């Protein structure tokens with residue numbers, strides 16, 4: 001359970017993302033793919049991309065980055081009351097895309113990394129704490145759905 005002040009921190013951070021959703025989404029996906037190349041293999045859409053330059057030049061990668069972070073922003077603005085929004089993503093990611101929960105942990109770390117990189121000296125220690133809690137909540141609630149469907153624990 002995040003506090004109100006922690007939710008406020010999270011959504012203040014998210015306001016930085018919303019000023020350039022495509023830019024953040026692209027930087028997150030590239031950080032993920034390059035830090036954890038197994039992740040790229042899950043995207044039949046993107047696995048042709050070999051180099052960071054090709055990733056950066058991919059307009060379609062940007063487009064998908066918008067789709068993904070738009071969904072995450074909507075979830076965060078629910079301040080934990082996200083059952084309806086989280087259900088479809090759980091089902092797709094477990095059963096269709098076949099994304100292990102561990103990869104969602106890597107995704108969370110890529111988000112944090114990119115926030116520091118884009119906003120140096122402006123992503124406060126309080127805000128990092130709050131964002132961690134928000135993301136941990138999202139992974140806990142997705143993981144329960146995966147467990148239900150026979151995918152994790």
Ligand code: HEM
Pocket residue numbers: 039040042043044045067068069071072088089092093097099103104107
């Ligand atoms: C915070 C984490 C994430 C969010 C909010 C998110 C959100 C979304 C959304 C909204 C879609 C399109 C709708 C859908 O198919 O359900 C999608 C598709 C997809 N996601 Fe994610 N996702 C996340 C994490 C991941 C991770 C970590 C991976 C892989 C390592 C992944 C792989 C995919 C794939 C393969 C698709 C299908 C893309 C296509 O071929 O068009 N997602 N995601």
Ligand SMILES: O=N[O-]
Pocket residue numbers: 031032035106109110111113
């Ligand atoms: O992308 N995690 O440092």
